[PDB]
Structure formats: structure tokens, C-alpha cells
């Protein structure tokens, strides 16, 4: 009846990756008011659906972390992770760099130890 066809298939050699691209970039916002500090670290070009726990690591430059500034949120679908969080300025004292890490779950935890970071 209708014209048929039955081609055999052939593997391609350069099966290049597609989809979004891993290039950690970002801009932080350390807005400070009366005695609390809201911080909006907007990151882009991150990992499609990953967790990005970010806090304030004190001077130590692997040092201790004021864990009372943990912000946990997930990375959208193109790596558009937007972290936010309030912390009394008194706790913040002696913090030197806001380190962004990957997470193992929305319950904090540490997977990667410093994917992106900035002084203050």
C-alpha cells in the first residue's frame, strides 16, 4: 500500500552535551537596617536542580561558620538559585566571607566546600 522504508541506524561520534551550562556567577546584597541583616545572594549559571546552602564563614581561608545565617533554597531549572536570610548583626561580627556551598538536602548539610564566595 503506502511506500515503506527500513534504514539501519548508525552511532554518532561527537555526542556533545546540551542543555544549560555550569558557570557559577552571582551578585550579593548585604542590606543592613536597625539590628538585623537581610542578605540576597542571587546566583546564575549554577546546577539545574541542586540545593545551595550559603552562610557566613568567619576569619580562619577555611574557617568556622556562623551557622545561624544558613539560607537553604533550590536552584530553579537553569541554575537560578536565589538565597535570602535575616541574622542579628551581633552574631555576624568577625565574619569575613559569605561562602556558597552545595547541599545534600533542604535540612542544611554540606556536599561541596565552596562553589562561589566573596569578601564581606
Amino acid at each position: 500500500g503506502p511506500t515503506e522504508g527500513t534504514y539501519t541506524l548508525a552511532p554518532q561520534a561527537v555526542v556533545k552535551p546540551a542543555g544549560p551550562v555550569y558557570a557559577p556567577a552571582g551578585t550579593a546584597k548585604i542590606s543592613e537596617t536597625l539590628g538585623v541583616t537581610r542578605t540576597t545572594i542571587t546566583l546564575t549559571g549554577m546546577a539545574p536542580y541542586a540545593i545551595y546552602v550559603a552562610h557566613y564563614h568567619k576569619m580562619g581561608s577555611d574557617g568556622p561558620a556562623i551557622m545561624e545565617s544558613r539560607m537553604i533554597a533550590q536552584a530553579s531549572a537553569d541554575g537560578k538559585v536565589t538565597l535570602t536570610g535575616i541574622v542579628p548583626t551581633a552574631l555576624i561580627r568577625d565574619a569575613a566571607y559569605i561562602n556558597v556551598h552545595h547541599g545534600r538536602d533542604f535540612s542544611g548539610a554540606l556536599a561541596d566546600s565552596g562553589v562561589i564566595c566573596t569578601p564581606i
Partner: peptide, 26 residues
């Protein structure tokens, strides 16, 4: 010699494994 490109490919794989792990874990 010419295995500099091989080193670059190894680095790309190193980053890709972490990216896959993180996306799937998320």
C-alpha cells in the same frame, strides 16, 4: 606532549560528575 587536551577533558569530567550528582540529588 599533546595530553594537555586529555587533562582538560579530565577536568571537564571531574566537573560534570559533580554537576550530575548535584542535579540528581536536588
Amino acid at each position: 606532549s599533546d595530553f594537555d587536551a586529555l587533562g582538560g577533558r579530565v577536568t571537564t569530567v571531574e566537573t560534570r560528575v559533580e554537576t550530575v550528582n548535584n542535579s540528581l540529588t536536588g
